[PDB]
Symmetry: C3
Subunit: 428 residues, 3 copies
């Protein structure tokens, strides 16, 4: 029901965040798979083979059986160390994307919550406007019947009333649909929410834009991620460069093998060559391999990776322009919000005083009922705009925190303290 | 020209669906490629080698020639069966995406068709409102000439007339662009379409939302596909698990080889060893292989696949939330649409009767020409809003059917039966 | 400050384009990697092995050392030539994508520049409207104090003034935010730009749509790219077909090897077999390989590739429909913009002449101050729409040139010649 409770219900079940946590876990777990080629590899092989000689070896047949334990162990292989470090950097990037998604849940939840309260206000103002027009229509009908006004005033007020009835259907539909957006993020249906306290509401000027820009440059999650990706690209050049280096591996095994020969030519001038052998061997060996020249393959991979590094550097400069754009437009939007709140508080007072003047002028003939109905629309429109500018102020405070890289649960708790009374999300 | 005909023309040529049918076809065909490793592999090899001995083998040279047919056949390999089953599942997924795409074509075609009809109505109303203002301007001009009204009435009417002339250009442009949207889906330009039969138009209350929700849960295509993905992620854990198991392969071959030696040291104390050999061999063998330990590689692949399955499970919950949002917001929109239609029908009657009241009021001095022009705008705006609310009702019916997973050609035929007379997509 | 200078500053530093240039460079460079298998491969190997006999060869031990230079060279391998031609084609595609991106920067830069000029005009008309309603409110407050008008006129004027104060806040915020959009593309903050020269502004009718369509078919960059993608898909069928062909390779090497045996059974009825050997070998050999039958693998790959080509063919049709939609809708929009410019010029003349009539009528009592303030809103709305329509006309010219495939720096220069005096992007 209040924003803290909605967000807590969202945080445990949100499937977009939960999927992101899964991606993160897989990426960390993958460090174990990337480390694996640097550890001992041990397999068991075993076979049987039947051979049948012919054409100049006709008469010599055999069947062999072999079985062995083989072991490989990397001694020097930069490329295998490089893959491990590449996977560790990939996990690091996935972690930041998780942090980015956590902050997105808070912003999206608080946004949907205020979208509900904003639709509740629109609908409540639309109904208050319907009831004021309805009173004008009612008093005008009574006056017409007693000869104080022409039937024209009833017919103009009825047309107006029918228009506000139609607007009420749409205000109502927008509130039902905002309620479903909130169920989509949170999983739940809320019949009532804690409303904004407008008797205690206040606005605060934001910190200077230079200071917000500095803090963003240190803490924005998108730009940390772009910096991690540029570093990853740099590591990928080293990986390309590793194709030039030699490798040194260790091998080891123990296997046995039988072999029995048979047929016309097994003996008789063979000389022990086709007897039965029952080998047994224990080996340990070192293997060294050095490239020298592969058609330009390496070198081309290096140069591609260098270009890839400049592309990642252009992405970092893109990310930087994006956080400048987001914090400066967020700063601007909060300042325009505060100025709109102030301009629409004043517009409500002067629209209410213009409405009472239209009523006074109508009772002495210098205004018509149309002037009174038009002034009722101007008042209710101003009231709507004032209520929406305050939600836009609160959303923009969220957006600025998000562009700093620090929107968190305490910020939700500070927004939650500006709430107070319950209001139904499905009134009549 | 009617919606049935437009759709039939779209269905044979639409490139987006035809691309999807190609993806599906390739995915099914790929099952044969995934099955292939389970079948006999047979190849022909042949070579010639020249050797020139040296340093303790100087004097012994040779040139060999060999050639053989080799055959391999998988006997036991879980991973090869698993790849086949994975490809079958991928084809299954691709088949549901094709179904999803076939339904999208229907929804997109019907939506574009009604958008043209809706742009036609806007343009027709903007022209009717033009003509009604033109008649007011013409009659005011005549009455000014005869001394019955001030020139202020002509001037106020001219300014409003000019505003609606500018509106007509924009209404026309929206019509031309809706027409190009339809050409892009369909491939064709339609100079006329069958309009909505408003004389016979009726609305029907939707089935209760719980029942639409149950049906969507059973048939929605998105959620069937998310279920099929979750199952595929489950199969991928098994595939990871298969890396622990042993393999059993069969090999077979037949090959010949020559070999002639030569040089200083071929004979003289050689001992037959360097004569000429003309081997011939027929082999058949079995090869068994068993992993034992690979640095934790398997296990890590298993755990990653388990995280991946949880990711797929969160994606299924996301898909569920999205179908719930789509059916509940489509249901609300349909009900709101029916209420808007009713509200606007009534608003057109009170607007018309208020416009007639402004004209009587003007003729006795209690209203001005400005009230008559304003009441003409109020009337045409309400007529527009009614015509739009009907298209919105019909579009939301389409959307709800699509969220159930059952939008089909009979539904298109039911919409086509709501159409009648031809109207031009390019009038003057 | 003028469009030519903004664009030059954008073109040297835009990171989105520079990333695109890096991608293209990597793709071209990759041609060297694809060619690499076709050139000599040469490597150095060297090892040491210790063996320890047992079970029927217990007593015979050894440690060997070997080292060789190995060289491979492809003689006949269609698949290797094919991979080269495929990479060349991928380079060709990437080059067109770079050409596309270069045109996008011209389009985005010119669009954002005109968005700032449009938002300057909105704000300046909003302020001009604020000042006109302030004069009405001032002149009415003085007539009120001298007894010439009731207080109801002051109250209606003040409510209206307040509504334009709130509009100014939002017009000023839209201008700050368009300035930040421009800074994002360009890298810079401009405190003044060269304004559209409206004294010299003219419109020109576009070429006939059939002619624009013909030229787009010949030059649109998206559809050139779709054509190259269809060609690439054609090449991929051949690549698949290559899996049936035989290969012919060349091998060569020079290596030495030692081997010293040892233990109980080295001699004594050995027979020279376990003496010390110091081999040396120089080789050159040819290796031929021919597939024959692989479980249906090839063939299935061919079929998949043929489906993939139809998919690419459907994409080409999609791209054509998209260029038709873009050229026909841009053509429509330009013509509509020209009609809009003409209609709003006329609407400002009739709106100004209706405001002057509201003033004469107010001074003789046939209109109220409310008519005067309403006619002031009509007048400034029409002036805003005219100014907007000119920017819309210019932006559509840009869009049409971009749909033809020929937007370039001479087009920018032609736009820059429609500019003149500086106006500030942050006024008060």
């Amino acid at each position: 029901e209040n924003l803290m409770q909605v967000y807590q219900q969202a945080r445990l079940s949100n499937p977009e965040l939960r999927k992101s946590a899964a991606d993160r876990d897989a990426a960390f777990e993958k460090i174990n798979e990337a480390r694996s080629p640097l550890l001992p590899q041990l397999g068991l092989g075993a076979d049987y083979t039947y051979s049948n000689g012919y054409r100049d070896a006709n008469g010599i047949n055999s069947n062999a059986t072999s079985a062995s334990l083989q072991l490989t162990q990397s001694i020097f292989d930069m490329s295998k160390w490089r893959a491990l470090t590449l996977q560790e950097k990939a996990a690091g990037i996935q972690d930041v994307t998780y942090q980015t998604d956590q902050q997105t849940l808070i912003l999206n939840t608080a946004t949907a919550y205020f979208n509900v309260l904003n639709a509740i206000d629109v609908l409540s103002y639309t109904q208050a406007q319907k009831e004021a027009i309805y009173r004008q229509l009612d008093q005008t009908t009574q006056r017409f019947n007693v000869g104080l006004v022409a039937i024209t005033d009833v017919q103009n007020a009825r047309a107006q009333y029918d228009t506000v009835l139609a607007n009420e259907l749409t205000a109502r539909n927008n509130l039902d649909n905002a309620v479903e957006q909130l169920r989509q993020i949170t999983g739940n249906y809320y019949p009532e929410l804690a409303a904004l306290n407008v008797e205690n509401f206040k606005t605060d000027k934001p910190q200077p834009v230079n200071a917000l820009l500095k803090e963003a440059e240190k803490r924005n999650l998108s730009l940390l991620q772009a910096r991690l990706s540029q570093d990853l690209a740099r590591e990928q050049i080293r990986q390309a460069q590793d194709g030039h280096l030699p490798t040194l591996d260790l091998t080891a095994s123990t296997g046995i093998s039988d072999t029995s020969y048979s047929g016309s030519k097994t003996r008789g001038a063979a000389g022990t060559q086709y007897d039965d052998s029952n080998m047994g061997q224990n080996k340990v060996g070192l293997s060294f391999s050095l490239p020298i020249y592969q058609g330009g393959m390496v070198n081309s991979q290096v140069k591609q990776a260098q270009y890839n590094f400049v592309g990642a550097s252009e992405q970092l400069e893109s990310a930087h322009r994006s956080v400048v754009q987001t914090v400066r437009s967020s700063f601007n939007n909060i300042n325009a919000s505060i100025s709109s709140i102030n301009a629409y508080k004043q517009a409500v007072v002067s629209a209410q005083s213009s409405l009472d003047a239209m009523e006074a002028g109508y009772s002495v003939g210098t205004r018509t009922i149309v002037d009174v109905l038009d002034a009722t629309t101007t008042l209710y429109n101003a009231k709507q705009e004032l209520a929406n500018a305050r939600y836009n102020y609160l959303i923009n405070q969220l957006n600025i925190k998000s562009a700093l890289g620090t929107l968190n649960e305490q910020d939700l708790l500070a927004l939650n303290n500006a709430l107070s009374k319950p209001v139904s999300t499905n009134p009549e």
